[PDB]
Amino acid sequence: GLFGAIAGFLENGWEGMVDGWYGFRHQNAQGTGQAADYKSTQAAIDQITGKLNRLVEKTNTEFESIESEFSEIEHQIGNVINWTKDSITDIWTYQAELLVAMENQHTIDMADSEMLNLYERVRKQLRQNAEEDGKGCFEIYHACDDSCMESIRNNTYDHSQYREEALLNRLNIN
Amino acid sequence: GLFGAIAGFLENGWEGMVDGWYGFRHQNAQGTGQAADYKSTQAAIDQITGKLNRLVEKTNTEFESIESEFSEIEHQIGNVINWTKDSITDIWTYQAELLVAMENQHTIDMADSEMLNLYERVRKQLRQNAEEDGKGCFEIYHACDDSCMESIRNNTYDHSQYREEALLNRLNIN
Amino acid sequence: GLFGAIAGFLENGWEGMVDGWYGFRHQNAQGTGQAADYKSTQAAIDQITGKLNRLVEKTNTEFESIESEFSEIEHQIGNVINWTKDSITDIWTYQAELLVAMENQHTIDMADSEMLNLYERVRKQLRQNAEEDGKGCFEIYHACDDSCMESIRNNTYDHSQYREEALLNRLNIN
Amino acid sequence: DKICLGHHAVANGTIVKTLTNEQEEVTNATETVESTGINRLCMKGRKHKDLGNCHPIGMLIGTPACDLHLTGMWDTLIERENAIAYCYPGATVNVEALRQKIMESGGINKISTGFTYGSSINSAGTTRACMRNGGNSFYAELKWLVSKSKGQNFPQTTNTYRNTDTAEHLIMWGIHHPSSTQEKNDLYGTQSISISVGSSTYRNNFVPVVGARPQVNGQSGRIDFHWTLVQPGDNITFSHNGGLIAPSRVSKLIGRGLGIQSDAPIDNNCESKCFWRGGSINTRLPFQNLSPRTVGQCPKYVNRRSLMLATGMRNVPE
Amino acid sequence: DKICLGHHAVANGTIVKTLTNEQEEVTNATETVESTGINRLCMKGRKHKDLGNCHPIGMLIGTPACDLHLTGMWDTLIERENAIAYCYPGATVNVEALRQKIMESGGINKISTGFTYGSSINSAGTTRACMRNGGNSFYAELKWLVSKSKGQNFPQTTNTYRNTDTAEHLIMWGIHHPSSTQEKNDLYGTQSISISVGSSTYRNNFVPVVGARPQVNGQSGRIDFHWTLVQPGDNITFSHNGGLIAPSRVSKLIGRGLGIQSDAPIDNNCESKCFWRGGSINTRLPFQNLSPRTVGQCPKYVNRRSLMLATGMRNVPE
Amino acid sequence: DKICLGHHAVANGTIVKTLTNEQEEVTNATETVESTGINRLCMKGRKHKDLGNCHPIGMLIGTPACDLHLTGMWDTLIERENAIAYCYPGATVNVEALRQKIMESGGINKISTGFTYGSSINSAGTTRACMRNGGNSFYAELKWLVSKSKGQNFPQTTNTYRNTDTAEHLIMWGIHHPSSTQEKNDLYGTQSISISVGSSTYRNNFVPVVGARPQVNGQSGRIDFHWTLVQPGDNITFSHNGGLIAPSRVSKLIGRGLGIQSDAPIDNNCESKCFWRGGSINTRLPFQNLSPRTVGQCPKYVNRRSLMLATGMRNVPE
Numbered sequence A, B, C: 001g002l003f004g005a006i007a008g009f010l011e012n013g014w015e016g017m018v019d020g021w022y023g024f025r026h027q028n029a030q031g032t033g034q035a036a037d038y039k040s041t042q043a044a045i046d047q048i049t050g051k052l053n054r055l056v057e058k059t060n061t062e063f064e065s066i067e068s069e070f071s072e073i074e075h076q077i078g079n080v081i082n083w084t085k086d087s088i089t090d091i092w093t094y095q096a097e098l099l100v101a102m103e104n105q106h107t108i109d110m111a112d113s114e115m116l117n118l119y120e121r122v123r124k125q126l127r128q129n130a131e132e133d134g135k136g137c138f139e140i141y142h143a144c145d146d147s148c149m150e151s152i153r154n155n156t157y158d159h160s161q162y163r164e165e166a167l168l169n170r171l172n173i174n
Numbered sequence D, E, F: 001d002k003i004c005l006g007h008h009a010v011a012n013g014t015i016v017k018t019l020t021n022e023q024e025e026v027t028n029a030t031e032t033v034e035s036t037g038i039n040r041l042c043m044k045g046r047k048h049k050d051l052g053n054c055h056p057i058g059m060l061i062g063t064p065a066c067d068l069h070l071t072g073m074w075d076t077l078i079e080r081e082n083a084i085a086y087c088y089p090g091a092t093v094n095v096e097a098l099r100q101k102i103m104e105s106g107g108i109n110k111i112s113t114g115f116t117y118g119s120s121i122n123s124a125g126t127t128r129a130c131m132r133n134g135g136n137s138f139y140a141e142l143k144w145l146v147s148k149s150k151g152q153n154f155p156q157t158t159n160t161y162r163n164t165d166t167a168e169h170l171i172m173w174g175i176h177h178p179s180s181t182q183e184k185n186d187l188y189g190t191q192s193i194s195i196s197v198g199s200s201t202y203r204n205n206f207v208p209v210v211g212a213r214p215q216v217n218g219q220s221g222r223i224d225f226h227w228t229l230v231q232p233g234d235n236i237t238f239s240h241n242g243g244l245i246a247p248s249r250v251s252k253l254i255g256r257g258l259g260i261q262s263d264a265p266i267d268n269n270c271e272s273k274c275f276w277r278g279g280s281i282n283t284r285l286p287f288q289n290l291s292p293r294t295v296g297q298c299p300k301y302v303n304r305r306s307l308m309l310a311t312g313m314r315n316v317p318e
């Protein structure tokens, strides 16, 4: 899709992440872990919320009847009315069809977008201390324990703290 | 453009590539080559086919005549009919105009994005073995024969196999 | 937002730049400076201009009166007319609302896009001589004077000139 | 050591349409077209009048079925099917324009015409077609004028209603068309019969016409009803010599109201702003597929069972 | 050693509109507005009736030009310009409503009225303005009632049509308006002429009026046609003493069909669902600029020669 | 050493709506809905005709208020509130159809009927209801025919207007309806009274009817006005014996024009193509919320005060 992450270079979703929309999985010496990212999940949710609010805002226009349910309508005027109403109906079913198709397109792509934006945020955090998988993972070239992992998700990772160790490992030297 | 590649950092298109929409041009010791990427080309084409399919679906709305071609319409009802029809035509030409302008904007941008996605995929494939031109090229810091070029286009390039050589060439020390 | 820059990894805008839409702030030995980028600013403005041109293109369609202001309308035909006019009005109000909501979403995202495209351009130009801070800045690992900064804004910066010194400062080895 | 970025997925996704794809699967979606309506008339918060078997036209002329609906105030008026307009058979000119005017009013006041008639006139003409409390009666707002002496010529007479109010008045009257010459002669005499009605803005003439025809409610005679609006300060004059079914009261339509045609049971518990033949429609959704004929503030009608709006990202399981 | 990413371009690009650019060049595009119609009425697969110079009203009253079209079944009905309804000059009251009713039917049955007339009545009134088989004739479904003895008074007569069927019946009749007193007296006598028509839902009276007027088809007389629907199980009664053009048959409109007005020739070899005065439209495109006046299942009319929809990326040549 | 990328911002940003945000702050925005109307009728560039207190229908029959508007050429016609159509009180059949037809014309010519009358007829009848130069007059384009011989029977007369032109003509006439039996007898005699009007396309009969009525402009008598179009080559014939208000001239509607109903002042220095009761609208904006009743080339009416279109990026202040 538009941003290349969701249904893109990320091969699939995580059914086990019922905690949020986007998130992290890590692996170090202590083992594995999973945590949802709140900010990115919320940015997407609030946008969906916006569309639903627009969908559900109502117009104030009150209409009266121009067709009797119980007594006959004169034939010519009746034909005019049927023609007008069907023409109005076609317009509205066209518009409804378009609204959904267009909105769905935008919804799908903005969620891809928020996924990518999170990915980019982490990439720049780690700068020269990690390398990209190509599959949405970063290989970290230093000892990253559960607190270091947490500081990455929590946006407090200080790259300069590990840069020396990391660069030597990326160069494969001592 | 939205995604920066087509009519962006890519100078121009390749007229001599009738093989597909997106593709590769390489240069090595054995000389030059060209090949189109099938996956990215079909991804774009499929989306355009999708729009064409939506353009062509039909409503089953039967209309009858409310304007006699061959006899006179009473003047007042005639003026109401003219007003309604013209109002409706104004809506549809407005709708028709907007559909095309909106669809075309999106079509151009998704095409831009599929190009970027291909570029980005290649970028992560090579990881530390190549550097970016800024013109859509990757300068490769190791010997890439025709089989190596093929491994890149076919998504099977193992970066670890050439990393040692490429690093030395990028740091310019031997 | 969609492209992650404006209201994204860029903390905020610059009120002091009344010179254009996008631009540069540098820090060097000789101090600070600020210059707007013309090419990126105009890409965005031209696109707003296109939107305004479509808004303003006029497609009438003369209409005549079907409702006397100064005399009574027969009641049944008058109700038909009222129902028709209100229906058309609901349609136009809906489209006017949709046009603006839709165009506005695209307007802000394309602006974010042009910002990212400038950023990416600078990144690729500087290639191995600088690193990203994640806030939209490039830390430059070589001495960069006014002529050097002005070359970055001008899109003429030659990376090969400073690379050796720059790799030296980044890698802190050799 | 490595850190991996990802997004969620669910087991059972939903299919939605996009510009480019007809069968796109997402994590969640919500309906945009209401298919469910309530088979009742949600009247909570609104002062409504159920007319039962009273037809709106009958409110103006005073058909027995409408005796409890000759006057009132309402913001919603409910007309039912097979409602009765006519006790004595007949028809109204421009009946539908009249019905619509009534069905968008917010009430009806009645005001007496003050018409009086001389000794040679029997103004209490009565018929078995219009029963009231076990007795032969007639339209409550009208009087069937008939010669007091059977067979004699109905005298030339003039009656003028003066609108002295500040708002326009709806006046209705009837023209009797006897089914036979004997009957016409018995009621109005052998003379040539003419009825003139004239205000400042309206004028028309009517002539009772004898003619054989089927019995409706046991009568082959017919009454044709006519109406007009009398402006404030204006007079309307009736000049006649037999065959006039005269107004004894005149109507005034008051304010505005919503008219509904439905035989759906009233529910005073629920509120609604949208109605149709089949009841009420309560939704926040912008579209519905219940009926193209609705009144009130309604979702637009569309010819689709379902239009799903995505509320989640692309579903990608594995 | 290097590898470059890129995209295709063409020599000949096409210009489209976008939200931000009126003149954007892309590799390919395709039309959304149909410009090409068909100058023929594509009637393949439809049971059609080409009325030729028979006007639809003529089908009901039996104008000689309509003899092949008094009855039939069809799913589409084709009316041509300058089609004939009236051999003897005149006009039909509520004409357009009647034409439209006929033009949305799927056939017409005719059922006899059974009207008989005494010997003092010549029910075979005939005219040179309605030729048939080389002889003076009259409307097939009607009868010109005239006094057998010239100058003598047309007798007082009554005729009642009984609808003993399960669907409504369309009945038509005419009133003759002579252009002279002599003419009037010759046909009907010196008496006062009146025609009364009554059923359970219809009543009306008609008075033949003598008056000088220009000749149409040689005749300065006029016949005005009237019509209503007789509901099932209802009776309609004609009480007359001259000037009534009596119905010998009534009509029944059966089912539904598509009404087309066009002077385009028929092609039984092409199929279509969309028609207009100029013929047919066959497209998959959602829009057309041929006519704002179409019938059937049609693309929406828009005021544009061309709206191109991009099917390729930006074209960036060098 | 470093270089930073950024975008601008402003202190005071404007709020706009997007698909996802009802309150998004951007750097600039522009209105799409016009709220400003002009309180004048901008007639620069157009050849107009301000009717003042002359009603368009008064142009055809020649009411004194319309003396300066009996003929002319225009591309826009301006009608004002309370404009006068009648001096002698009455009404016109199919009045709104006629008004609209005049209001979309681009001019009017008057052509004489050439009607002549026998000495037994006074054709110069006149009334205090229509004043010219402070004295009794009548409709300029009509003649009130009355027996010269008071109480004596109006002669049975025939008048025929033949249209010798290549275009249809609008012919109007009146029928007098007296307010008393004495008034009737004095003007036309004691005989039965009929007016017959026939062409190739039109025929109708009219009978003057006596009736007591309120006085309008001093009169309780009335005149019903009637009209048709006489086609080129056709003749139309009036047969009558009292009560015809006869046409002395006939109308010819020329070209097309824009009809405006408004009481706004005329401005000859401003141009415009969109009008409503309150004046003119000059905008480039596609929408307006001034009025759902406009004429000419107008923005579409919308139910919103404002719909701001972003012309800048998100405002992110600091």
Ligand SMILES: CC(=O)N[C@H]1[C@H]([C@H](O)[C@H](O)CO)O[C@@](O)(C(=O)O)C[C@@H]1O
Binding pocket: D125, D126, D127, D128, D129, D136, D144, D146, D178, D179, D183, D219, D220, D221, D222
């Ligand atoms: C006004 C009047 O006298 N009403 C009489 C009517 C009329 O003569 C016919 O209904 C006219 O059609 O006939 C009755 O049988 C009826 O309806 O009860 C008796 C009643 O006394």
Ligand SMILES: *[C@@H]1O[C@H](CO)[C@@H](O)[C@H](O)[C@H]1NC(C)=O
Binding pocket: A074, A075, A076, A078, A079, A082
């Ligand atoms: C109008 O449409 C309804 C069906 O929706 C149909 O029953 C009715 O007959 C139509 N009216 C006319 C005059 O054809």
Ligand SMILES: *[C@@H]1O[C@H](CO)[C@@H](O)[C@H](O)[C@H]1NC(C)=O
Binding pocket: B074, B075, B076, B078, B079, B082
């Ligand atoms: C309706 O529009 C048609 C086509 O423009 C025109 O010929 C006709 O005169 C109009 N009818 C009226 C009553 O103005």
Ligand SMILES: *[C@@H]1O[C@H](CO)[C@@H](O)[C@H](O)[C@H]1NC(C)=O
Binding pocket: C074, C075, C076, C078, C079, C082
């Ligand atoms: C039509 O709408 C106008 C404007 O609200 C109103 O004044 C008028 O009375 C309506 N007409 C009818 C017949 O209800």
Ligand SMILES: *[C@@H]1O[C@H](CO)[C@@H](O)[C@H](O)[C@H]1NC(C)=O
Binding pocket: D162, D200, D233, D234, D235, F214, F215
């Ligand atoms: C109505 O009648 C009264 C007297 O009954 C009279 O004073 C008044 O002027 C009349 N109104 C009109 C409009 O004739």
Ligand SMILES: *[C@@H]1O[C@H](CO)[C@@H](O)[C@H](O)[C@H]1NC(C)=O
Binding pocket: D214, D215, E162, E200, E233, E234, E235
């Ligand atoms: C029609 O006439 C028949 C026979 O005269 C009769 O049985 C039937 O009831 C009549 N129908 C009506 C509605 O009067």
Ligand SMILES: *[C@@H]1O[C@H](CO)[C@@H](O)[C@H](O)[C@H]1NC(C)=O
Binding pocket: E214, E215, F162, F200, F233, F234, F235
């Ligand atoms: C009109 O009258 C003239 C002379 O009276 C006659 O020659 C012409 O044929 C008539 N036209 C019609 C249509 O009757």
